[PDB]
Scaffold this active site. Structure first.
Site, PDB file in Angstrom:
ATOM      1  CD  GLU A   1      47.885  43.286  26.018  1.00 20.92           C
ATOM      2  OE1 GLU A   1      47.587  42.313  26.738  1.00 20.92           O
ATOM      3  OE2 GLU A   1      48.935  43.919  26.158  1.00 20.92           O
TER       4      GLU A   1
ATOM      5  CG  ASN B   1      48.225  39.773  35.511  1.00 21.60           C
ATOM      6  OD1 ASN B   1      47.469  40.752  35.603  1.00 21.60           O
ATOM      7  ND2 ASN B   1      48.510  39.244  34.407  1.00 21.60           N
TER       8      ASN B   1
ATOM      9  CG  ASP C   1      50.044  41.122  40.392  1.00 21.12           C
ATOM     10  OD1 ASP C   1      49.032  40.652  39.908  1.00 21.12           O
ATOM     11  OD2 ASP C   1      50.297  42.285  40.187  1.00 21.12           O
TER      12      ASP C   1
ATOM     13  CB  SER D   1      46.454  42.074  39.303  1.00 21.65           C
ATOM     14  OG  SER D   1      47.511  41.699  38.442  1.00 21.65           O
TER      15      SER D   1
ATOM     16  CG  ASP E   1      46.058  41.648  32.625  1.00 18.54           C
ATOM     17  OD1 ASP E   1      46.241  42.520  33.467  1.00 18.54           O
ATOM     18  OD2 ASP E   1      46.996  41.032  32.165  1.00 18.54           O
TER      19      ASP E   1
ATOM     20  CG  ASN F   1      46.773  44.601  36.243  1.00 20.51           C
ATOM     21  OD1 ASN F   1      47.062  45.159  37.294  1.00 20.51           O
ATOM     22  ND2 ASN F   1      46.812  43.283  36.093  1.00 20.51           N
TER      23      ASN F   1
ATOM     24  CG  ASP G   1      50.184  55.752  33.229  1.00 16.93           C
ATOM     25  OD1 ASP G   1      51.154  55.737  32.432  1.00 16.93           O
ATOM     26  OD2 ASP G   1      49.741  54.723  33.755  1.00 16.93           O
TER      27      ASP G   1
END
Ligand code: CL
Ligand code: CL
Ligand code: NA
Ligand code: NA
EC number: 3.2.1.17
Length: 129
Positions: A35, A46, A48, A50, A52, A59, A101
């Site tokens: 990562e 990203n 979209d 967003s 990281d 995110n 989650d």
């Protein structure tokens, strides 16, 4: 801060990641390698809008507030900049919520693609833990 492999393993072990929700430490090291290359200051934007953040590239669409991801949640209740700190506590505690989650470590694309089903124990081999 750019961690050594063994140093990160040790920090992650101290923070309760070793077998957290069944994921051995090697998994977390492997995810962090791919990562962020073990750099706490890693950011990546990203498609979209967003971003990281940090060693585990958490995110902003769901997990942290960066003030620029319209319509996003802040489920770890932290500013995203707290994930960039040389102290991995905030990243580790948010990771624990994420991995709980429903999707486990599949939430980290790089874990699914580069770590899952590999010999992840290799990532902590040789380390004094
Ligand atoms: Cl936002
Ligand atoms: Cl990948
Ligand atoms: Na992180
Ligand atoms: Na957010």
């Amino acid at each position: 801060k750019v961690f050594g492999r063994c140093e990160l393993a040790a920090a992650m072990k101290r923070h309760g990641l070793d077998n957290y929700r069944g994921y051995s430490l090697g998994n977390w090291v492997c995810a962090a390698k791919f990562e962020s290359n073990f750099n706490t200051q890693a950011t990546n934007r990203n498609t979209d809008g967003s971003t990281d953040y940090g060693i585990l590239q958490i995110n902003s669409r769901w997990w942290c507030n960066d003030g620029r991801t319209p319509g996003s949640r802040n489920l770890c209740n932290i500013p995203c900049s707290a994930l960039l700190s040389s102290d991995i506590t905030a990243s580790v505690n948010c990771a624990k919520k994420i991995v709980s989650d429903g999707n486990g470590m599949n939430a980290w694309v790089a874990w699914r693609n580069r770590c899952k089903g590999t010999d992840v124990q290799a990532w902590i081999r040789g380390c004094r833990l």
